[PDB]
A paper describes a structure:
Here, we report a noncanonical FAD-dependent enzyme Orf1 that adds a glycine-derived N-formimidoyl group to glycinothricin to form the antibiotic BD-12. X-ray crystallography was used to investigate this complex enzymatic process, which showed Orf1 has two substrate-binding sites that sit 13.5 Å apart unlike canonical FAD-dependent oxidoreductases. One site could accommodate glycine and the other glycinothricin or glycylthricin. The resultant product is no longer sensitive to aminoglycoside-modifying enzymes, a strategy that antibiotic-producing species employ to counter drug resistance in competing species.
Each single structure orchestrates two apparent binding cavities one for FAD and the other one for glycine. It adopts an extended conformation with the isoalloxazine ring compartmentalizing the FAD-binding domain and the glycine-binding domain that sits above the re-face of the isoalloxazine ring. The compartment divided by the FAD cofactor is enclosed by four splayed β-strands curving around the isoalloxazine ring with two loop regions that define the glycine binding site. The crystals treated with glycine or sarcosine showed an extra electron density where the α-C atom of glycine or sarcosine is best described as a sp3 configuration. The glycine is anchored in place by: (a) Nη2 and Nε of R342 that H-bond with the terminal carboxylate of glycine (2.8 and 2.9 Å) and π-stack with the guanidine group of R368; (b) the α-C atom of glycine is at a H-bonding distance to the N5 atom of the isoalloxazine ring (3.0 Å); (c) the amine group of glycine forms a H-bond with the carbonyl group of R368 (2.9 Å). H284 and Y294 are associated with each other via H-bonding (4.1 Å) in close proximity to the amino group (4.9 Å) of glycine, presumably serving as a catalytic dyad to deprotonate α-amine of glycine in support of the hydride transfer mechanism, as the activity of site-directed mutants H284A and Y294F was compromised to some extent. In the Orf1-glycine complex structure, an extra chunk of electron density extended from the terminal thiol group of C281, which was unexpectedly spotted (the only residue out of 12 cysteine residues in a single polypeptide chain) at the glycylthricin binding site, a location next door to the glycine binding cavity and 14.7 Å away from the N5 of FAD. This electron density appears to exhibit two different lobes a short one and an extended one (at the “H subunit” of the structure).
Author numbering:
A (entry chain D): 13 to 491
B (entry chain A), C (entry chain B), D (entry chain C): 10 to 491
The structure:
Amino acid sequence: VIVVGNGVLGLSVGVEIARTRPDVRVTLLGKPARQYGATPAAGAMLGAFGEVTAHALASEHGRKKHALAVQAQRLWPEWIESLEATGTAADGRIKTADDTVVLLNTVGHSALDDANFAAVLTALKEANAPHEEIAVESVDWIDPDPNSRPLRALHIEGEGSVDSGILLAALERSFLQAGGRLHPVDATEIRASHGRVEGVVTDDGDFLPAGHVVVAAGARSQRLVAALPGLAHRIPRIYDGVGVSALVDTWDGSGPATVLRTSNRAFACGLHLVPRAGGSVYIGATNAVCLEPRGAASIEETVFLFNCATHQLHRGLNGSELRKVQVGSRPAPIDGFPLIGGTSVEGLWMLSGTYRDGLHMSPLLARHVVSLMDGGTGVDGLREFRPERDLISAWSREEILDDVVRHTMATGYEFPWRLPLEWPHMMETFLQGPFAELADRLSDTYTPPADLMTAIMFSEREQQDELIAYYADVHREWH
Amino acid sequence: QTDVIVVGNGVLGLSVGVEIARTRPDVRVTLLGKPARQYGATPAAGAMLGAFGEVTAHALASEHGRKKHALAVQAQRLWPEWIESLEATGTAADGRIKTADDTVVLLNTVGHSALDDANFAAVLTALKEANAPHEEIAVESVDWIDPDPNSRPLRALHIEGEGSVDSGILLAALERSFLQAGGRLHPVDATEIRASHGRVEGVVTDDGDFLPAGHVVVAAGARSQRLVAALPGLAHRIPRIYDGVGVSALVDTWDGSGPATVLRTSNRAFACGLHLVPRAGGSVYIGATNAVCLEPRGAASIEETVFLFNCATHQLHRGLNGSELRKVQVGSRPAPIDGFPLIGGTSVEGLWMLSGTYRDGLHMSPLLARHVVSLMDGGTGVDGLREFRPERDLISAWSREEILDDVVRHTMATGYEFPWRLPLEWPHMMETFLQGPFAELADRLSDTYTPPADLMTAIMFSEREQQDELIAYYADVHREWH
Amino acid sequence: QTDVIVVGNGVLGLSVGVEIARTRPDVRVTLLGKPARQYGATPAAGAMLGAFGEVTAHALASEHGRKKHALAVQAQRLWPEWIESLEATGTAADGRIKTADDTVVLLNTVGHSALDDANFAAVLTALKEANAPHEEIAVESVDWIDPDPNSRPLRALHIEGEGSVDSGILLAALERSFLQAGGRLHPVDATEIRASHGRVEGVVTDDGDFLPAGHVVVAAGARSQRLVAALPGLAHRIPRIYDGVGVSALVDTWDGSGPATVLRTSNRAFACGLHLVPRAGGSVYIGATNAVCLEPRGAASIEETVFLFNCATHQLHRGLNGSELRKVQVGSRPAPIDGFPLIGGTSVEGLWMLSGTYRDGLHMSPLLARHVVSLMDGGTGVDGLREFRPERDLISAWSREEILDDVVRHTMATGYEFPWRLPLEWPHMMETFLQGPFAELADRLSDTYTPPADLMTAIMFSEREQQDELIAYYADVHREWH
Amino acid sequence: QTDVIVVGNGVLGLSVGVEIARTRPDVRVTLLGKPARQYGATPAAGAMLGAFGEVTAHALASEHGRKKHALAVQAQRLWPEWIESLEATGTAADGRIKTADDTVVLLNTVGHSALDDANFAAVLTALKEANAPHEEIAVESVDWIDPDPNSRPLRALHIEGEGSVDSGILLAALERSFLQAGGRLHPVDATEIRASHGRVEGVVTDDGDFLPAGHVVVAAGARSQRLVAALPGLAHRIPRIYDGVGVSALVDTWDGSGPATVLRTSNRAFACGLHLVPRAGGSVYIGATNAVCLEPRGAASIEETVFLFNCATHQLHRGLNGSELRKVQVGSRPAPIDGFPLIGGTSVEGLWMLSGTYRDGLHMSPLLARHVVSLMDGGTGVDGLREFRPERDLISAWSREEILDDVVRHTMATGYEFPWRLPLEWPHMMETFLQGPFAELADRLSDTYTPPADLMTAIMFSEREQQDELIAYYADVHREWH
Ligand SMILES: Cc1cc2nc3c(=O)[nH]c(=O)nc-3n(C[C@H](O)[C@H](O)[C@H](O)COP(=O)(O)OP(=O)(O)OC[C@H]3O[C@@H](n4cnc5c(N)ncnc54)[C@H](O)[C@@H]3O)c2cc1C
Ligand SMILES: Cc1cc2nc3c(=O)[nH]c(=O)nc-3n(C[C@H](O)[C@H](O)[C@H](O)COP(=O)(O)OP(=O)(O)OC[C@H]3O[C@@H](n4cnc5c(N)ncnc54)[C@H](O)[C@@H]3O)c2cc1C
């Protein structure tokens, strides 16, 4: 078995394969630099209920994704125990918090933040999850700007966070302990013929043979498989959801006892603080879907993240020392849903397109793919997210056009801007036409989700034309 | 018969006038004051029948504040039958006194957490303690409002049976009801109260005339103490009343709509606040600023107009931005120097006062009127109003420490309510550097008396000569009573 | 008759009234209009004798704009003797028409570089071209001003002999001078101009009366075209005039001080602008907003009041913030649909128009009055005003492309003048998304006519029915003239 | 020995190293310091060859400030031939030390008028006094810039022959030139200077070794006084040097473009400033914050990063907003406690110092190097450096009153540079309430010494124990020198 990719998904599937099939040789590809790596740029939150939006839970596909997140949360305590078991005290602790506080402030669009707060409360009650709405005065540690302060707060019990760096180290160590081998090169090409995988050409010119190849190369995953015959229009594209986060040494070495977060905001950015050991906090995280990868933060991303954290969470962060600006690529599927499971090529598997919550879902996703590889049926709810598929249409064009204008306006309210009171209504009216024109031009059948539609709107004419051709080639393949 | 003169033609003068005229067929009652109602609080009022909406943590932390609150809750019970009795003297064409039955209190972040969050909690507690009908409601369920999202409320409280009146229709109904009961309106001002052998003789008017009386009731708003202070000893025995200058506006809404309820915040920096009071005929009332001034002012500052308009358009309804301004209104809330009203009798036989009611004299008017009329008839009026007798040593309802904490918090709230945008370290620095100057002023003014925050800020920014005159006043009061 | 009726009692009606009365003592001249001056531009004006201060790059880029500018410079020469002749009919106690001799133009960054920087350069160029006395001065040398440092000017231009008048004292002096010259004031409105056999017979008034005349001069401000449009054919032969609704204010300064000069910016988004005009007696005039409205409006919006006050307090003097608001004033600048005035004769014998002067009819008034009186006497009046004859095809002074560039720039300027605070990518995005809708509207309205930016924005945000009626109007004009 | 040890591998150490090596080929010169250059000012510098751009009204108001300015002007004359001599030891492929020949100073309103307007005037005066080539230019003529219109400059000044260097390429050229002249690089730190019988013996290094020398030149940046203060008496005879922590950034521009000139403002609140220094290969340098810290700091605060980025994106080029952040750089400007450099000889024979150069040691480096080498050869070096001898009583370059005016003005400037948005009365209130606490601190610290504003603000917000330690330090210095 060859696992292509050394993020949370590759290493998690690597560990599960190595541990459950001691009869098989498992090799994991990827380099210590983890170029464009989502996992090392993550806090990370074990986000299930915190990831709930009204828009997600309005669609059948969104409700399915949410069910999987709730299932994954149950696996984390024993998964962490099993990974820490391979180490010693000096390796540090994977878990950094047990609980999450969701804050509601007015530094955002009512149409996102108010709707999403209501949706989180409903989803918690529906799941019989332990939680309570608490007085904001009872939230320890926070020191917001009064004009940026929360007026409601929600305590979620047993929804916590991990140190993504300590998790990656624990996964690598656990992989080696179970007889896995780490080969620090990248796959250049998957070799297959007579409808079956033969192995992987690496970027040092070598060839590694295999009966099974599992592609978990984050935002590079579809580009790798798309080289095989037909698969260019049978595996949904995955783009770079470029995310900026930061490590901050707090002014007094303090940190909150819980995750602090807002609900998901304009184009799947959001504000959160994840506790870390040793007088550090993680703050995150911006999001921008990019049609080509980017490995450096924009000035705008850094200013936005810092401004939100200092005003809405703790003014003490303003005088705190910046240790690191981190950048990683959320694997952003073109149809808005993950690519998990088997392929029309025997022995070829994919684990990708997980966007904001692959790290959280990792133990569940790993166990699902390993079950499938062993001739099992894995987890009942994952079939719709099979990687070889027509593009999913989870929303009407009308729903998406309402969403993209609302998210565009939310980039103003989240800044937060100060404008003449008539300007927002004028901007809303003048945004509708151009987005409706773009959606109608791209395809008669497919509509990109808002996060991708905004990226396409502001891309070059040539990039838009190439996407029109892609959508036409997909329609031809499947209809 | 034995003549009564009421000095003042606001809500308190006219309300006592109506009650005397109706209950005392033995008395001829003459009410003084001009149609212009110079510096008049009542015509500038929305007005809210504010009892629970007027609750602050700071008010209910003092015994005097809790006593004042009990009286406001009692007054609310009198309004339905009072309005019936006033409308009875008119016809349909005179219009309706009541403009709303219910109030929604909104909590947004365009203000200081130390005022708005504390006060929202205090209002909820006071409602529950009183067993008053109310509920916390979803903000999405508040009809009509269309705030700027960055200025929007995240909590809302529905108060059942706490409503509003049209202050103009109330004044017209009071005047008409006064005349119907045999009262006479004499449109001149009192210049001087005449007394000798410890009894009132009557009033010199500003047309040079003298009107004799056995009883003089002073309800001249912010002018009330200045009028009586001319009589022997009374300069240091009747607490001073200053002008709580308030700006409000009448707006013709873009579509002729209005909310079904009062919309308000809790009381904000130095007893300003944001509210919308429904009116008939496609008008809304928006209010209201507050600034304690050591001398009267009858025109709005540019700052007051911009602040009121900016708050209403952002926090209540952006539609008000394109709405037509009909009138900017200015009136003087009678602001007592010791923070409590001046209600009842005097050391001068036949001399009575009804004043120093600040934000809620109009709401309390039927109760206050019935109290003073009962006292004039040899009754005991309303239990609990004895503490607010007009001839008194200055009340000390708070420690100097409580007031110094309050004045710094209210100063900072003028920033958060703007709302300002500043470097994140600036507020803490300003807070630290405000404490010393206010502590120095409080210590300099008097060893015994501390002005409430609303007055202390006015004194801080007044001329050296005005501060020195107040030091002398406080010293003369201490000498009189100790 | 040989009787003359002037319809309208603003600066243009009264100025032409005075000139007719003085030069034809043999004829009866009657001037119509009421003391209320409903929607009156003149009483809402400061007013600046604005010639060089009114220069914009956009105006001087067109032949028609350069012609209008030449006339403004000519008008300035008439003011000293005009004022002498008007004050001559009064006494010392009537007060002085002139309130300042000089103007300082300030350049700050509370606005669009594409308007304010371009316009500052255009004013400097026009002054140098005219050999007019002026100096660029250090901002530190501008007396009186006390701006917010973040709103302060960094350049200042002293214009010698470009001053201001008190519009109220001017109107009083014109009425008095009209009577002195044998004019009669009849305080009613014209309802109808009566004509037949291609000649005026007189005016029906709103009291039901009929006044006969050989000459009718229409100077009814924004009502002028609506009045004449009732006569056969004239609906599509006299360019429409709309209401350029303008808000200004009178402020009593905190210390009774004022600047010795006019203080102004260049003309800003959609022909608004910021200025302070000195007044006597501790008052200043601040102005002035502009919004072209397809129907008249006589009350300020909240938005207009907040914008004017915010600009004046930040950019001119923070002392205005604590100053007392005396009056909010609203008047209608007569806004011609083709961007140029309507001055002179008609196809109806004895029917004359003096209107559509927008921002600078008051400044041009002595020149315009003398021009129309010369024409009435069979003269040729002033060279260069023939192009602005009232009975005309709509002028096309700019390409559709120039106007579309202008309307997007002016739209963006409403943001920068606020001033807004936005993410740095938002303005470019808004600019890109504004171009298409304005291009679509311009193409839809007419194949030949394009409204100037100030009108195009009003049409963009008007009702579908109002847009359709304008499409029909433009089509009927094209049919009449082509 | 006749051996020379240079302690420090910044611009000053390497520059003096090169000059010694080149002029004394007979002697062994060893330079200490590690490639990491911990807290190093030089590698965090753009850097501007700032002479006229560094002019402030406040600097040129003092005799010591005028002396410092004269030296900066003298240094600028040396740069062309100094660069020629350093590039001569390399080839084209080493890159070019010079990145721009000219500087444009921009004046915008994102700052305090009391700093930015005064400083712009002071720069213009200093250029004219020096007969320096310069022109005030139209802002529209400044190439490349694309500011937010609300943040845009309205004046611009072109300074000819005041340019910038790549600090990294300069350090590489200095190291290469040092080796070419026979210098030896020993990559360890000095721990201790050894001296007895009033003469240097050499240096103990942090690897435990001892290097003998007849001459030790201390150029260890902000660590320089701490190193020499260990010798007898010198703790209170060598003025303390603190860390002027400065944050800068390298940005890859969206299109690989950059300006042809340095772009800068004048020096702003507490010796921060905004500038962009061109670099090769599609990079720009932006700088630079300043904070005097009583202990060294090697990481940027969030506040420093946000402020730098916000100023550059608004005031210089909005294109930087979408540009990629390559590196946040932090270095320590050596901040002398008395505000002036420590340059020259000591009471210890063979012991020299080159430090406390704050914002402009890099610029002054060729002049400072030549000065110390002249002194070591028994010369008098450069006229006017005598006041800045390292062994001295603390300089008192300003009255306590001047410094107290300055510290309040600089405090207020941190608001205007943000830029904040606050109620118009708040700034005057803050100014009044800042004066007392700073006056109290100045009076408490010492009866004779007053820290300059940049240090006084750091002391104001430091711990009580840190303030008390400074009171003791000042008392020990007074005792030593009086
Ligand atoms: C700023 C940020 C914040 C986040 N916060 C959270 C959070 O709070 N909670 C959460 O659950 N998740 C979070 N995530 C992550 C999210 O869950 C992702 O979907 C998840 O990390 C995806 O993991 P992955 O292993 O699929 O991809 P990655 O983590 O990107 O791993 C892919 C790896 O494969 C390597 N690779 C690429 N090409 C090749 C090749 N040809 N051969 C070999 N190796 C290759 C890459 O270099 C990389 O190291 C966050 C991500 C970002 C960017
Ligand atoms: C902006 C604003 C908003 C308000 N909103 C509310 C509200 O929502 N709810 C509420 O309950 N109350 C409100 N109030 C009013 C508050 O309750 C006042 O305390 C109350 O109106 C005081 O009434 P009064 O009759 O004592 O005084 P006033 O209403 O001031 O009446 C005094 C009258 O006496 C006249 N007078 C003065 N001197 C003489 C003289 N020498 N001789 C004769 N006549 C004289 C004055 O001209 C005046 O007309 C508001 C007031 C203001 C200013």
